[PDB]
Ligand binder design. Structure first.
Ligand SMILES: Cc1cn([C@H]2C[C@H](OP(=O)(O)O)[C@@H](COP(=O)(O)O)O2)c(=O)[nH]c1=O
Ligand SMILES: [Ca+2]
Length: 129
């Protein structure tokens, strides 16, 4: 897998963000995670978390997996990095997302995120409190 450049257009919620990718605006859905919706418990904190992560980053990168690169809603499916740190993994580590929507062939970082979820649960963070 490899990292490609992108720039923030707009923070949306915990697991979606608007980025410019090869010069085109695009909504990205974070692979392998599920944040609560804004109106749900920890939704606002998930949105705040992702928003600050991507807004403070001097360098956003997108990393496609080996499978489907856009979902049925036209959203990009990727791992998103903010100054080399994976937003997907950071949300799970902080208990602001659950490992989820694990589909065969788009699951390269599954065990890395499950390891983060195990530590978050151990610490009873946020969703696991
Ligand atoms: C994360 C992810 C979601 N999706 C689709 C499945 C879900 O379908 P449904 O809309 O039919 O429930 C939806 C979940 O996204 P959200 O959690 O953003 O709603 O997005 C994929 O198809 N591939 C993926 O990798
Ligand atoms: Ca969600």
């Amino acid at each position: 897998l490899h990292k490609e450049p992108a720039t923030l257009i707009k923070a949306i919620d915990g697991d979606t963000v608007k980025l410019m990718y090869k010069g085109q605006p695009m909504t990205f859905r974070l692979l392998l995670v599920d944040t609560p919706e804004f109106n749900e418990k920890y939704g606002p904190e998930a949105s705040a978390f992702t928003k600050k992560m991507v807004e403070n980053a001097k360098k956003i990168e997108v990393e496609f997996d080996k499978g489907q690169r856009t979902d049925k809603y036209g959203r990009g499916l990727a791992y998103i990095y903010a100054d080399g740190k994976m937003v997907n993994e950071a949300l799970v580590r902080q208990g602001l997302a659950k490992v989820a929507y694990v589909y065969k062939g788009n699951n390269t970082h599954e065990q890395l995120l499950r390891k983060a979820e195990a530590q978050s649960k151990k610490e009873k963070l946020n969703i696991w409190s």
